[PDB]
C-alpha cells in the first residue's frame, strides 16, 4: 500500500464515477438540441469511454455548451488518470532499479 498505487486505485474509481455521471449528464444537456445524437444512455456511456481514452472515433459528440463542458471534464479526468497510472509505474520501476543497484 504505497502512495502511487493507492492514488492509481482512487483514480480508477473516480474515473468510473466520472464516466457514469458524464453519461447521464451528457444526455441531460443534449436532449432539446435539434440534431443532437448523444441522447440515450448506453451509447452515451460508450461516448464517455471514447472521450476519456481520447479514442474519439467521431460517431458521437456533444453539440451543446453544457454537453461540451461535460465532455471537457471527462477528457481531463481520463487523461490525468492515465498519466497518474504512468507516474505510478515510473515510481515502481525507479524504486526497483534503486534496489537493484543496491542504493
Amino acid at each position, epitope marked *: 500500500s504505497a502512495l502511487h498505487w493507492r492514488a492509481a486505485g482512487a483514480a480508477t474509481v473516480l474515473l468510473v464515477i466520472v464516466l457514469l455521471a458524464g453519461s*447521464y449528464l451528457a444526455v441531460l444537456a*443534449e*436532449r*432539446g438540441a*435539434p440534431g443532437a*445524437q448523444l*441522447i*440515450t*444512455y*448506453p451509447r452515451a456511456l460508450w461516448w464517455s469511454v471514447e472521450t476519456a481514452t481520447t479514442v474519439a472515433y467521431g460517431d458521437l459528440y456533444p453539440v451543446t455548451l453544457w454537453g461540451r463542458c461535460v465532455a471537457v471534464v471527462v477528457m481531463v479526468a481520463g487523461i490525468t488518470s492515465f498519466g497518474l497510472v504512468t507516474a505510478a509505474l515510473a515510481t515502481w520501476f525507479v524504486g526497483r532499479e534503486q534496489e537493484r543497484r543496491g542504493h
Partner: antibody
Amino acid sequence: QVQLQQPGAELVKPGASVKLSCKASGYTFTSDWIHWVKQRPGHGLEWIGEIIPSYGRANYNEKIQKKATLTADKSSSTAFMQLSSLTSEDSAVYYCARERGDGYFAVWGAGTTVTVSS
Amino acid sequence: DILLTQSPAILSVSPGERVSFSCRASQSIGTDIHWYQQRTNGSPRLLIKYASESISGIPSRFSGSGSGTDFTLSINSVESEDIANYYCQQSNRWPFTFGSGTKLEIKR
C-alpha cells in the same frame, strides 16, 4: 399492474386550461423519461414533449405552437401536462409514455380524451 | 429533424400471407427505429425495438429488418388480430419523430 394511469376524459371551455396527469407504477429509474403524444381523431401520433422526473427538466417539440408545460411530482410518481388556452384544434387524445432513456416507448398510458367546447 | 416516410399508407393482404410495412428515414439513422401497433380505440403497443429486436409477449410472426434509411416491419401469416395502424419512430437524433402510419387491411 397498469404501468401508467391517466384519466379518461377532460372537458375544457375554449380559452381555458387543463392539467393532465399520468401516475406511474412498476420499476422507477433515475434515467426514466416521461413523454407526451397528441393524436387527433383519425390522425397520426405527434410528439409533444418529454420530462425527466428525477431532474425536472422538460423539452418540447419546436415545430408546433407550444401549448404544454410539463412538470413532475417525484413523491407521488406523477407527471403533469398543463395545456393552456385551448382551441378546438387542441381536442385530441393525449397519451403519456415511459421511455427508459434508450429511445423507445416501452409502455403507454390509455390516453386522456380532451374535448374543447362550451 | 428526421422525417419518417411510411408508404403505402394502406396495405391490403389476404389471410395467411406475409406482409411488409416500409419506413424510410430522411437521413441515415443506424438501427434506431422502433415499431408500434395501434388497434382501433387502443393505445400504441411496442412491437419491435432497434429495427429487429424482439419484444417479450409479441407474437413471433412479427419481425423487423433494415438499417441506414430503409426499414421494414414484417408479419408472417397475417391474421385478423393484426388489423391496426402501424407506426415507426426514430431515436437517433433529437427530437424523436414518428412516421405517419400504415393501415393493415385483410381481404377476406
